[PDB]
Amino acid sequence: SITGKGAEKAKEKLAEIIVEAVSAVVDDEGKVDKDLIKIEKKSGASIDDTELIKGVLVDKERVSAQMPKKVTDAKIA
Amino acid sequence: LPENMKRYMGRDAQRMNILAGRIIAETVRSTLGPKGMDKMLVDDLGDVVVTNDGVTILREMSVEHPAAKMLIEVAKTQEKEVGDGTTTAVVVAGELLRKAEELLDQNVHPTIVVKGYQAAAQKAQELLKTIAMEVGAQDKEILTKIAMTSITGKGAEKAKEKLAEIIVEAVSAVVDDEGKVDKDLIKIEKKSGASIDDTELIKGVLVDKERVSAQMPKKVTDAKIALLNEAIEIKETETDAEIRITDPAKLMEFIEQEEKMLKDMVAEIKASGANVLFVQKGIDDLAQHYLAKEGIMAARRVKKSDMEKLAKATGANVITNIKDLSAQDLGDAGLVEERKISGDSMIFVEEVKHPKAVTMLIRGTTEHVIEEVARAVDDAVGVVGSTIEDGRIVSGGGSTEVELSMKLREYAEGISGREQLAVRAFADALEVIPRTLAENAGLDAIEILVKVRAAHASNGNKYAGLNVFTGAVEDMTENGVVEPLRVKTQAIQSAAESTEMLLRIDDVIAAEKLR
Amino acid sequence: LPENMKRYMGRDAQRMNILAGRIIAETVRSTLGPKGMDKMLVDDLGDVVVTNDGVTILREMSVEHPAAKMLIEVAKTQEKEVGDGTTTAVVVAGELLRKAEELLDQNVHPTIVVKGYQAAAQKAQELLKTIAMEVGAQDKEILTKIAMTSITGKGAEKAKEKLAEIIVEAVSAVVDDEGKVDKDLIKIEKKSGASIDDTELIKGVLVDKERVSAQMPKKVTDAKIALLNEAIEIKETETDAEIRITDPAKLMEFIEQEEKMLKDMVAEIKASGANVLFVQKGIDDLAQHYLAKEGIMAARRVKKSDMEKLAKATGANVITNIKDLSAQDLGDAGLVEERKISGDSMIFVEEVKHPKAVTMLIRGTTEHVIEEVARAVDDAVGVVGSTIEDGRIVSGGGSTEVELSMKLREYAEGISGREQLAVRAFADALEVIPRTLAENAGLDAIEILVKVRAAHASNGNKYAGLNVFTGAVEDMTENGVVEPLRVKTQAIQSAAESTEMLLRIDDVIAAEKLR
């Protein structure tokens, strides 16, 4: 499915990542829930640096720099 | 018939794309090299800018054609934004588009043209790796020749070697422990008057502003700097209030009460222990008094670009609310001084906490060359940074393009398959560069091409090119004309990708609100 | 073909650029020299300006063509600012552009034409150094001859020598210990009535205003001057308040309260000890009374340029807020008096603190010669000052250009290369100056050119030129017709650079929101 769409350098790498993400979201019924997999895109580096993240990604900055850059054991509102 | 009708509109549409792409290439083509011609940009308002910097033209042009917009974008964007060969790429792309028209008329399918160009482009990459010369990132002489090569023809001839040394000195400072060069850490500032000989390097960040009140100190040492992104004014209630005065004695009391507020704001700032203050917005005239009376050097309505570089340099945090201001949020600078220069005055921030901040102050007599030298230094910073990171260079002056061209025609003889036609085209196309370089020097571009080819023949000199000053074919390495490897590689890749895009687009379709 | 199409559009564009520059040159060409013709400028509103000052035309023209705007900018801006050589640069430039057309038609590439012009311009620079004559910066008689030469033909003919001495004395006063001349300290003022014989030199700064209230004193001695950049009015609450009056007794009570406020503001002003007050903004009518009752001479709505020249002259500080005004901030002047000139009236500030500050008050019957003499005097201040700094002069009246042209034709025979053709052209181009000078005098421009060439023949006379008054070729030094070296070099430099710009621009491209 990916062939010819512009990856063409590491196809299989990107494919292995897809397979892993899809294999994880199979529920007890055996059906696949697509909504849990989000696809994000950002410039720089190269497709070889494409990575799979075990959480959700937001493109935003903390509204005030005075807020902590890093938070552990986060309770999110 | 309906669907055979689209095929006629499409194949014309693709040819119209190439046509637009070729026109974009030709508009900038004459600007390449030491002798490169400059173009005059004019807008609706009537004011004009004259520059030979091709990227500035492509960026500032009036381009209306979607294929032209796309070709510019693909070629302009690069993996390493540090260094500019982009104009050279656009020119090669436009030549590659010319050749592709002929292959298409001969019934070579577009994918086969792409297959040849991709094959030829990769082979060019490898050849560049083998021809390149390695240099030490700590070698100052080579970095200087890199700069002089990029600066040649940009209008500072007597200041060329001096200005190059300053650039190398400036770039060498920003090399981190990683060995990588951060281009944002080098700041280029420009103001007219005096002469280009007076161009100087400042060890801190420079802001062009005047102290908001002359009553404030011009100079502050051991500065604790506060960066405020909020205007200093009388604070309105967001809740939409009005005020009624029943007593004439109270008419002054309100004025005096709001005056007290301004005192209270200034006191809170002084309470953090800040000597110097920069604000992106405005300062009430009366609050300006109390800041001066409190001995604080302040400036109002500062540009946001200055605000961020001050924050990164001094370690201060940009602050949205006066309540956020704390001693920890302050930046540190050894000296903050408003200094008078030939033309005007400006605020220097020097002896900064983080040594990474550095500023290139470019002087000169006429502003239209000031912008030009400014634009040239940005590229010169680019090529030098790439040289420090990669540590590989190639001979300039079109010598590299001629070598690649011959080696690719050689490689094309090896191809067994239908894409052979495209590889020679890619090979032939690269020769536009030296040919352009030769004609901008007032010479016969064809004889120079043949003379340079002859130097690269047999075994030959891979560095041989035309010396525009002596008019003879010479070894470009011995003449010190050199440019980063990354420049040539990024140029071929961008040239090939941008041309591959237009070549891969068959139809153009009207759309509804894309972005 | 697409890319061969652009090359024809660009060539049209360059020919149109050269065409556009030549028109600008011819529009101002006849204004050169003592007999220079003057042009009548008219605008949309219908009012007109008739002037012989070419720089004024180039500045006030309605120029629509981008190439003309650029040629004006490059030629107009010059280092050290002499001021009378700009038009000569433009005229020579237009002649170089004419020559360039023929050279381009002959298939001389632009860079080779530039190569020739650059070579010839430098050789001209060197020749000027050797032809120049050194004079003492303290020599007043030659400085007067500099002045008379520059003012000649501007309509001051009767009073030329007197007015020249006034210029020399005015410039001689502002020379600092460094030896440099500060132009900003000399102010040029103009008012109608009387005659140019009544032009006088004032030892202080002059302001054109009347005292805001006739009740104020016309004359003040030992004045303590206050410069206020803030309006004197009732201060509104920044919070936007309204007022309600329930009691008829209070309706006066509020009015009386505002009266108290204005008294207190005036009281604070007198508390600083100011005799005289200048305000860049306006003064409330009632405050005018309270200022008069306190014996303070005040003027409202003063131009900021006046505020700035007053501050440096008297030593006062411009003050934005009444709270900042203090006795230390006041300026000192021996006499401040409002006097009536023929016609209206003005405030003279004399016996000022700063001895360098000086003002030239130019009188005369007709305003269009008044403006013209003013414009003339401004150039003479520049022209005389340059001689004091440089200490070198050359013979005027076209002698220099004829010497340079012939020596350059001599130099051109020595050049072996393609730019020789451009060198000979550059030499021929300089002949436009004496030829123009001769025709403005009502003579045969060609025979005068030949006679002057003949005078420069053999070892001849390097100073020989046309005396427009006697109509014969004479020694310009013995006739006292001389002008600074710096003007001639800057004119040669400006003429060469401006043409070099147009020659390097091959295409003109449409842009969007350039600045």
Distance CA B116, CA B114 (A): 5
Query: What burial letters (b/e) apply to C77-101, b meaning 16+ CB within 10 Å?
Result: bbeeebbbbbbbbbbbbbbbbbbbe
Sheet with strand C186-190: strands edge to edge:
C186-190, C358-362, C200-202
Instruction: Tell me which residue has tokens 């405050």.
Output: C287
Any catalytic annotation for residue C320? Answer: no
- ∠ Cα C239 C244 C248 (to 5°): 145
Cross-strand pairs, B220: B336
Q: Report the residue of C107, C238, C420 to disrupt the B interface, i.e. the one with the largest count of B CBs within 10 Å.
A: C238
Radius of gyration of chain C, Cα coordinates, nearest whole angstrom: 29
Query: In chain B, which residues have their Cβ closer than 8 Å to the Cβ of A46?
Result: 79
The answer for residues whose C-beta is within 8 angstroms of residue C397's C-beta and 6 or more apart is C33, C434, C437, C465, C466, C467, C468, C476, C479, C481
The answer for residues whose C-beta is within 8 angstroms of residue B226's C-beta and 6 or more apart is B269, B272, B274, B276, B277, B278, B316, B319, B325, B329, B330, B331
Distance CA B87, CA B29 (A): 8
Q: How far is CA B266 from CA A63, B237, B321, B383, in A?
A: 25, 20, 13, 47
Distance CA C170, CA C221 (A): 24
Q: Report the residue of B310, B320, B504 to disrupt the A interface, i.e. the one with the largest count of A CBs within 10 Å.
A: B320
The tokens for B221 are 């040492």
Query: What burial letters (b/e) apply to C382-391, b meaning 16+ CB within 10 Å?
Result: bbbbbbbbbb
Distance CA C286, CA B5 (A): 85
The tokens for C29 are 């060409």
H-state helical runs in B132-159 = 140-151
For residue C201, the tally of other CB atoms under 10 A from its CB is 15
CATH 2.70.98.10, domain A1-54, yes or no: no
Any catalytic annotation for residue C366? Answer: no
C-alpha C74, offset from chain centre: 16
Q: How far is CA C394 from CA A18, B263, C160, C441, C475, in A?
A: 84, 64, 21, 22, 12
Query: What chain A residue is nearest to B329 in terms of C-alpha separation?
Result: A66
The residues of A whose Cβ lies within 8 A of any Cβ of B are 46, 64-66
Distance CA C379, CA C386 (A): 11
Distance CA A5, CA A18 (A): 15
Distance CA B269, CA B316 (A): 14
May I ask the CATH class of domain C206-388? alpha beta
DSSP state of C443: S
Closest CA to C407 of C419, C422, C424: C424
Residue C280, min C-alpha distance to chain B (Å): 16
Helix (H, G, I), strand (E, B) or coil at B39: strand
The tokens for A44 are 């720089």
- ∠ Cα C404 C406 C409 (to 5°): 105
- Determine contact, residues C452/C434, Cβ cutoff 8 Å: yes
- Determine contact, residues C226/C310, Cβ cutoff 8 Å: no
Query: In chain B, which residues have their Cβ closer than 8 Å to the Cβ of A65?
Result: 317-318
Distance CA B464, CA B486 (A): 20
Helix (H, G, I), strand (E, B) or coil at B268: helix
Distance CA C485, CA C263 (A): 60
H-state helical runs in C157-293 = 160-173, 248-271, 285-293
For residue B413, the tally of other CB atoms under 10 A from its CB is 11
The tokens for C138 are 């303290």
**Dihedral sign from CA coordinates of B315, B316, B320, B323:** positive
May I ask the CATH class of domain C140-203+389-393? alpha beta
Distance CA C308, CA C311 (A): 5
Helix (H, G, I), strand (E, B) or coil at B261: helix
Query: In chain C, which residues have their Cβ closer than 8 Å to the Cβ of B286?
Result: 321, 323
Distance CA B482, CA B460 (A): 18
Distance CA B493, CA B489 (A): 6
Closest CA to B279 of B314, B304, B312, B262: B304
Residue B408, min C-alpha distance to chain C (Å): 25
Q: At what angle do helices C66-76 and C86-105 cross, to 10 degrees?
A: 130
Distance CA B41, CA B30 (A): 15
Instruction: Tell me which residue has tokens 């079109």.
Output: B398
Helix (H, G, I), strand (E, B) or coil at B318: strand
- ∠ Cα C347 C353 C355 (to 5°): 100
Q: Do B62 and C511 touch (CB under 8 A)?
A: yes
- ∠ Cα B485 B488 B491 (to 5°): 145
- What's the topology of domain B206-386? GroEL (3.50.7)
Q: Do B320 and A64 touch (CB under 8 A)?
A: yes
Distance CA C452, CA C447 (A): 9
Distance CA C487, CA C483 (A): 7
Distance CA B475, CA A61 (A): 53
Instruction: Tell me which residue has tokens 């006849």.
Output: C30
Q: How far is CA B113 from CA B16, B424, C512, in A?
A: 18, 11, 35
Distance CA B121, CA C169 (A): 74
Any catalytic annotation for residue B152? Answer: no
The most distant pair of C-alpha atoms in chain B lies apart, rounded to whole Å, by 103
For residue B115, the tally of other CB atoms under 10 A from its CB is 17
Distance CA C404, CA C431 (A): 9
> Chains contacting C with at least 3 CB pairs below 8 Å?
B
C-alpha B167, offset from chain centre: 15
Distance CA B317, CA B310 (A): 9
Q: If 0-12 CB within 10 Å is exposed, 13-18 middle and 19+ buried, where does residue B169 land? A: middle
For residue B109, the tally of other CB atoms under 10 A from its CB is 11
C-alpha A74, offset from chain centre: 20
The answer for residues whose C-beta is within 8 angstroms of residue C137's C-beta and 6 or more apart is C175, C179, C387, C388, C389, C391
DSSP state of A25: T
Cross-strand pairs, B465: B474
The answer for residues whose C-beta is within 8 angstroms of residue C408's C-beta and 6 or more apart is C120, C123, C124, C423, C424, C426, C427, C430
DSSP state of C477: T
Q: At what angle do helices C86-105 and C2-29 cross, to 10 degrees?
A: 140
- Determine contact, residues B97/B22, Cβ cutoff 8 Å: yes
Instruction: Tell me which residue has tokens 């700064």.
Output: C205
Number of residues written out for chain B: 515
H-state helical runs in C321-457 = 367-390, 399-414, 420-430, 432-440, 445-456
C-alpha C215, offset from chain centre: 39
- Determine contact, residues B216/B292, Cβ cutoff 8 Å: yes
Q: How far is CA B461 from CA B51, B395, B400, B465, B477, in A?
A: 34, 11, 10, 9, 10
Strands C464-467 and C505-510: unpaired
The experimental resolution of this structure, in angstroms, equals 3.1
**Dihedral sign from CA coordinates of B114, B116, B117, B121:** positive
The answer for residues whose C-beta is within 8 angstroms of residue B66's C-beta and 6 or more apart is B20, B508
The tokens for C49 are 């300006």
- Determine contact, residues B300/B282, Cβ cutoff 8 Å: yes
* Annotated catalytic residue, options C306, C378, C379, C475: C379
Judging contact as 3 or more Cβ pairs under 8 Å, the answer for A and C is no
B414: enclosing H helix or E strand: helix B399-414
Query: What burial letters (b/e) apply to C318-335, b meaning 16+ CB within 10 Å?
Result: bbbbbebbeeebbbbbee
- Determine contact, residues B412/B420, Cβ cutoff 8 Å: yes
Closest CA to C412 of C402, C401, C425, C400: C425
Residue B500, min C-alpha distance to chain A (Å): 12
Distance CA B376, CA B84 (A): 10
- Determine contact, residues C211/C276, Cβ cutoff 8 Å: no
Strands C482-484 and C186-190: unpaired
Distance CA B304, CA C79 (A): 33
- ∠ Cα C365 C369 C370 (to 5°): 70
- ∠ Cα B17 B23 B29 (to 5°): 135
C338: enclosing H helix or E strand: strand C331-340
Q: Do C243 and B242 touch (CB under 8 A)?
A: no
Amino acid at B203: K
Beta strand residue intervals within B162-320, DSSP E = 186-190, 200-202, 206-207, 219-228, 243-245, 276-279, 297-299, 318-319
Nearest CB neighbour to C515, from listed B47, B242, B443:
B47
Sheet with strand B38-42: strands edge to edge:
B48-51, B38-42, C505-510
Distance CA B400, CA B131 (A): 8
Closest CA to B52 of B305, B419, B372: B372
Instruction: Tell me which residue has tokens 């393609």.
Output: C418
Strands B345-352 and B206-207: antiparallel
Q: How far is CA C383 from CA C361, C375, C464, in A?
A: 19, 12, 22
Nearest CB neighbour to C79, from listed B42, B57, B365:
B365
Q: Phi first, then psi: give them for residue B200, nearest 5 degrees.
A: -130, 160
Distance CA B290, CA B293 (A): 5
> Chains contacting B with at least 3 CB pairs below 8 Å?
A, C
Beta strand residue intervals within B308-380, DSSP E = 318-319, 331-340, 345-352, 358-362
Closest CA to C33 of C481, C449, C464: C481
Distance CA C303, CA C207 (A): 9
Q: Phi first, then psi: give them for residue C49, nearest 5 degrees.
A: -135, 125
- Determine contact, residues C144/C184, Cβ cutoff 8 Å: no
